[PDB]
Amino acid sequence: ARIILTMGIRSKASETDLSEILPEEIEERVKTAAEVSMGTEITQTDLDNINALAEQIVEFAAYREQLSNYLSARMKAIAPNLTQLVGELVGARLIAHSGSLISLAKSPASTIQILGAEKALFRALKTKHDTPKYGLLYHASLVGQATGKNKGKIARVLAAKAAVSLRYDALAEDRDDSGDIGLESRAKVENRLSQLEGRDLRTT
């Protein structure tokens, strides 16, 4: 959208350049495709609607990132230790999954582990199969840092510390919105992730 707002037309692209969009290596490709192309030439009365749509979706993404700013702000003002541990939008869809923050706080840590994967969980319980291990908590950055079966392992330890921090946030009264319990819990999860990424199943 930003590039068609910038140039508009192919001969206009032949006379203009751009570096704030499309970084430094697709320029020769768009210029060669501007020189030779199977595309027609548009008029101004529909280039105007093309430009209106392009500025429309540019402003749409501006609204998207500022709504994400609002979500980050309300989340770190409502349950900030969960933000310090698992992150803003992950904790947000945890809370939005379980309904209330207190209804998520009074659930055990195993539930917070498997919280997104209910259909896989209950089919793997109603026939005697193996249950999932990730759920909605798979998209946390720590589980992203883990690799192998120990992302199941630190999904478990991350759900345990997230239950700790989450019910602290929901049940505290002298809470300070400063991330202290979430930060010490995150340090615990990070050095645990370190000590099980340091081991290796090879023999040296």
Of 19, 24, 37, 202, the one binding another protein by CB under 8 A: 37
- What does 122-163 look like in DSSP terms, one character per residue? HHHHHTT-PPPS-GGGGGSHHHHH--SSHHHHHHHHHHHHHH
162 binds, among another protein, RNA, none (CB under 5 to 8 A by kind): none
Q: Angle 40-45-49 (CA atoms, 0-180°, nearest 5)?
A: 90
In contact, 56 and 63? CB cutoff 8 Å? no
Two tokens, residue 103: 């209804």
What's at 125, amino acid-wise? L
Output the CA angle 169-172-177, nearest 5 degrees.
Answer: 55
| Contact flags string 54-93 toward RNA, x per CB under 7 A | ---------------------------------------x
Q: Is 46 in the site for another protein (CB under 8 A)?
A: yes
Return the residue of 21, 26, 49, 122 that touches another protein, per CB under 8 A: 49
Q: Cβ closer to another protein: 37 or 191?
A: 37
* C-beta closer to another protein: residue 67 or 187: 67
Instruction: Retrieve residue 45's tokens.
Output: 């009365």
Interacting residues toward another protein by CB under 8 A: 32, 35-38, 40-43, 45-46, 48-49, 52-53, 56, 59-60, 63, 66-67, 70, 73-74
